[PDB]
Every structure is written in structure tokens, then in C-alpha cells.
Structure 1
Amino acid sequence: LPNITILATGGTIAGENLVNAVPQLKDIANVKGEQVVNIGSQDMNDNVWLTLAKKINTDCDKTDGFVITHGTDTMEETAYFLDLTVKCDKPVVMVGAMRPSTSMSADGPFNLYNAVVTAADKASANRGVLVVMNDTVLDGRDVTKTNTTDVATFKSVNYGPLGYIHNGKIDYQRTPARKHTSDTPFDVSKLNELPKVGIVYNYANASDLPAKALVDAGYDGIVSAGVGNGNLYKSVFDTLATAAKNGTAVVRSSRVPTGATTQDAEVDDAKYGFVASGTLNPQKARVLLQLALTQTKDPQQIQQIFNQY
């Protein structure tokens, strides 16, 4: 049976003695566990992302597959960052739990089994970094937390899941078209920090003060959580238009939960030097802007990255 390595970033999701908390694991894989860090995923950050990507890239030859236990609140961010930076061609399957392991009908035990199932399936390779939640296999790019409490909260709300899991078997009927893992230029192996990218929210009577404080602090890039198709309130627009011209990378995304922020529709991106996020929501667009800045600062080149990854 396959060797699967579970990497923990926080508290347990089942019951390392995960094999005894969920004993059916041993029937389908030889499982070992390492505790890379122990934090709540709302405090997730750049430092954790780099050592995770380094650890998976380094240990790729020792194992057949990676399962990562992670909190749910930012799992969709870490999955996309790894989706872009992992160079290992074995499956990397992220999993968490919407109910705590010691509460009634806890979801983590079965989620973990299914995560392991997915990570040991030979059909799972070459589909990029995955998230396995509620009997479903979702790609790291599009998967997002959809509901604040529901066990079924994780959905790929724009293009759908890759496969459903029934009785330890996976019917895979899709694979992500955007370039992932190996197909990307991004290499973080020797980086110790990551370009500073903040996110500002748009609303009625919106303040430019948040955007201005990131401009003042010399942030390399800003992501706008626009309204509608990536639209900005006039104050925020002016502040970010100014900032664009003097070298800040500005990416128009949207607060709207589904749908692309499209190029040349509402906003002359070419005129102002902006970048349209596509279907990347603000926190997802941040992850790609961070990595884009490490290869080029040119707004047209970043846009092409946003259309390719």
C-alpha cells in the first residue's frame, strides 16, 4: 500500500496517533505524520507558506503523497499558493474540518480518510494541489469557503469539482486547465519573504484611507475587492490610479463571490495601468500577485500571468 505523509499545521481534525483515531486508514495506506507548525488558520501567513512549499518540494522523493491538515478559514488561500509553488508531482491533498473532532458527528474523521484516499489514488496526480472536503475533490484555484458553518461549505463555485468520492473510489470527470505546480515559473525555494500585497474593500461611501496607508507603507501591490465587475469607489480609484503610475501593482478583483472580474469592460485597465483578476477572488488574487511580483513588475506582464495561472 502507498506511503502517505500527513503534514499538520494546527490542531488535530480527528480523534502522530491519527492512525488510531481513524483506524481504517491503515487498510488503505502506510501513514506517518509531522507537525510543521501549530497555529489557527486565521493567523496563517507568509512564513508558514514558504516552509510548507519547501518541505513538500524537499521531501517529495521520500513518500508517495502528501495530506495537509489545515484550518478551514484560510485553507483556500494556502491551497492556491501551494498550487503555484509545489514542484512535486505526487498528489498534495489539503483537508480540514468544519466541526471540532470532539463534537457530535464530527466531519474530520471521514474527511481525513477521503483525503488519504484521494492522495493515494494514482488518478489524482497531475491535477495540481487539491482540497478534499465532504466527499468531493476540488482544485486549489477555484475552491473557496462558501458558508460560515456548513460541513459542505467548500465549493469550486465557478468551474465545479474534479470528482466525487464514494466508498473509497473517485470518479474523476474534470481537471484544471490553468497551469499549476511544475508548469509555473514561480520558485520560492530560496526566498525568505514574499512581496507585500494588501487588499482593500469597496462599498458605498468608501474611504481611501486604507488604500492610502498601504501606499504610504510602500506596499509592492494592492488587490481591490471591487463592486460588481471589479469597480472601485471614486476615492479608492483615484488613490489606486495615482499609485499605479508610480509603480504599485494594482489588481481589480471583486467582493462578489462568483464570476470573473473581466478585462476592458468597466475600467480602462490599459489607461490606468491596472490588472483584472479574472475569477480570482480578492484573497486568491493576492496569492498570484505576490508570486507575480517575484518575476516581473510590469502591469502588462502580470496581466498575462493572471490570464495563464
Structure 2
Amino acid sequence: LPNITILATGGTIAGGGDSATKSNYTVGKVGVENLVNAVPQLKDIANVKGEQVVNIGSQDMNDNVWLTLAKKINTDCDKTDGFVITHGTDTMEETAYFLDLTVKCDKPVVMVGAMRPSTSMSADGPFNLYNAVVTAADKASANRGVLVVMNDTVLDGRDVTMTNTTDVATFKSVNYGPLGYIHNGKIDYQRTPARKHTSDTPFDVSKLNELPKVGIVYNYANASDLPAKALVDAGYDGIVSAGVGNGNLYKSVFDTLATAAKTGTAVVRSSRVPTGATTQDAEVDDAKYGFVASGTLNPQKARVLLQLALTQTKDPQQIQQIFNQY
């Protein structure tokens, strides 16, 4: 049986409400010991040890927790055969991509959450955690980058995102599909992510205590330029635009971000639309303004890569190449 370390961070998986049949709940009621102990079948497949790293709702996820988790996994890689990280669902897709770029352990790292609190009827958390440990225990999971395991599916940390606010089946890799499906404790992998991850990235957060400041602005009809200007005035290192359609900008947001890019703020165009690439060579001349096109990276993912790009470089053409490789 492999040794598997559970790093716990809180979330609805550890969360609880006063009723099995009412939606109300709060995160962080159940600690890692009782989480693990609630799935005695874990003992059939692995030697499991739990550590509680933080205890937050993933809506409060932040750069300090990201830095703690990357350093812990990198430090502890040699002590275990694989990692499972229990986490809220809300920003699991962000943390998974951060780890995918910063973890230097090529052993399996698997994230897992729950869409129903531990107290609800038909709670999804137990079986999700079981299948997370199945995945982290599988030799075939190594070298695929950081994974999310939800609803019997293995998803790569770059493409994985939420599709639905409440559905237990919400996590999908919406552009390039899942890597494998889990049936009776076994995985048929048919895919692996081409984009560089983990030990083939240059990103090394081992000595960083803070990350570059990157904010996200939304585009819509009659959008205000005032949020964009407030990030510029606060000296943010970068701004990601959640653009309309193929990464387009309301005219005043365009005007503000064009000036910011010219005066040294890194600007990435992404899209509020949930699938497909924000492309070069459409309506916006990125080369002219020094903007970066996000590709399939959604605004929150693009933020992750932009912050790490900014630990390497501030040059727009070098950031674009990062966006083409990771």
C-alpha cells in the first residue's frame, strides 16, 4: 500500500449544516483526522496521513496559502508516494493551476472537494476522497501534472473549471476533456496535458513570500473604466481582462488598459465566455498595445500564469511566449 499524504485546507468537504435536507452550511467544521476516519475504506488502498494546513472556505483562498502548499509539497515530496489536497470547490480550479506550475514533485498531486457538505443526504465528499486517494496511489498518475478528481473523473489542473453552481458533476475540462475515468478503483488514462507543468516550468516559489499583484476586471455593456484605473493607480503588476466574446474590451476599458500596457502594467486579454481561446489576430492588435492573449486560460487561470510570469519577466513578448507554453 502506498503512503499518501492528505493536506487539508478546509472547504465544503470539511463543512457542515444543522440538517441533512436543508442547503445551509459553513466550511471548516470537520478536521482532517475525522475526514479520513469517516472513510475507513481508505485503509484498503493506502497508508494515509493527514495534515491540516489551513481551514478556510476556498472563496477566501489567497497567495499565502498557495505559497505554503507549493513549499510543503516540494519539501515533503521525498517523504511520501503521493499527495491529496482537500479544498473548497469555489477556487479549486485556481489552486490546481498554481500548483500545476509550481510543484516540482512529479509524484501524483490530486486535489479534491465536495459540492455537498459532509452532513447532507448523499454527500459526495466520501466517495470523492476515496477516488482522489485511488488516483494519487496509481503509478500511472505521475508525470501528468497536478490533478483534480471529482465525480469519478481525473481532470488536469490547467483545463479543469466549474460548469455549474451546485451540480456534483460541475468540474469539467471544458476545452480539451478529462484525462481518465475511474471505475471500480481503476483508471483508464487516455490523455495527458501537452502544456508544460511541474518540474518543466521555470517558476520556483521556494524563497518567495509574496506574489506579483494581478487583478481581474469584467467587461459588459456600458462598463466603467474605474476598476481598471484603480488597479493601475495602486501600482498592480498586471491586469487580466474578462473580455466579451473573443477577449474584447469595452471602449473605455480598452483606452485605460492600452495606456497601462504602454506604461509598463502587464495586460492579459481573457474572456468571460466559459470555453474557447482568447485568440491573437482578431479585432485587437495585441503587438501594437503590448497586450497578451490568454488562449484557453479563463480570467482566473490567466491571473495565475500572469502572476508567475511576472516573477520571471515584465516583457510583453516574453509573457506571450509563457502563455503559449504553460
What is the rounded CA distance, in whole Å, between the counterparts of 1:305 and 1:115 in structure 2?
A: 30
* Deviation at residue 265 of structure 1 after TM alignment: 1.4
* Deviation at residue 165 of structure 1 after TM alignment: 0.2
Q: Deviations over 1:43-68 (max 9, x none)?
A: 00000000000000000010000000
Distance 1:11 1:254, change over 3 A: closer
* Deviation at residue 266 of structure 1 after TM alignment: 1.5
In the superposition, the TM-score normalised over structure 1's length comes to 0.99
Q: How many residues align?
A: 309
What is the rounded CA distance, in whole Å, between the counterparts of 2:156 and 2:36 in structure 1?
A: 26
Point out the more displaced range, 19-28 or 128-137. 19-28
What is the rounded CA distance, in whole Å, between the counterparts of 2:198 and 2:250 in structure 1?
A: 36
What is the rounded CA distance, in whole Å, between the counterparts of 1:39 and 1:131 in structure 2?
A: 19
> What corresponds to 2:210 in structure 1?
193
What is the rounded CA distance, in whole Å, between the counterparts of 2:94 and 2:34 in structure 1?
A: 28
Task: Assess if the C-alpha contact under 8 Å between 1:84 and 1:184 holds in 2.
Answer: yes
Task: Assess if the C-alpha contact under 8 Å between 2:268 and 2:291 holds in 1.
Answer: yes
* Deviation at residue 11 of structure 1 after TM alignment: 4.9
Task: Assess if the C-alpha contact under 8 Å between 2:12 and 2:114 holds in 1.
Answer: no
Task: Assess if the C-alpha contact under 8 Å between 1:15 and 1:21 holds in 2.
Answer: no
What is the rounded CA distance, in whole Å, between the counterparts of 1:168 and 1:193 in structure 2?
A: 39
Task: Assess if the C-alpha contact under 8 Å between 1:15 and 1:102 holds in 2.
Answer: no
What is the rounded CA distance, in whole Å, between the counterparts of 2:204 and 2:157 in structure 1?
A: 18
* Deviation at residue 16 of structure 1 after TM alignment: 1.3
Q: Deviations over 1:230-269 (max 9, x none)?
A: 1000000000000000000000000000000001212000
* Deviation at residue 17 of structure 1 after TM alignment: 3.4
Q: Alignment identity in percent? A: 99
Q: Deviations over 1:195-224 (max 9, x none)?
A: 000000000000000000000000010000
What is the rounded CA distance, in whole Å, between the counterparts of 2:173 and 2:131 in structure 1?
A: 18
Q: Which consecutive unaligned segments of at least 5 residues does structure 2 have?
A: 14-30
SS in 2 for 1:155: strand
> What corresponds to 1:36 in structure 2?
53
SS in 2 for 1:37: strand
What is the rounded CA distance, in whole Å, between the counterparts of 1:17 and 1:212 in structure 2?
A: 47
Q: Which consecutive unaligned segments of at least 5 residues does structure 1 have?
A: none
> What corresponds to 1:292 in structure 2?
309
In the superposition, the TM-score normalised over structure 2's length comes to 0.94
Task: Assess if the C-alpha contact under 8 Å between 2:242 and 2:272 holds in 1.
Answer: yes
Distance 1:19 1:234, change over 3 A: closer
What is the rounded CA distance, in whole Å, between the counterparts of 2:177 and 2:283 in structure 1?
A: 27
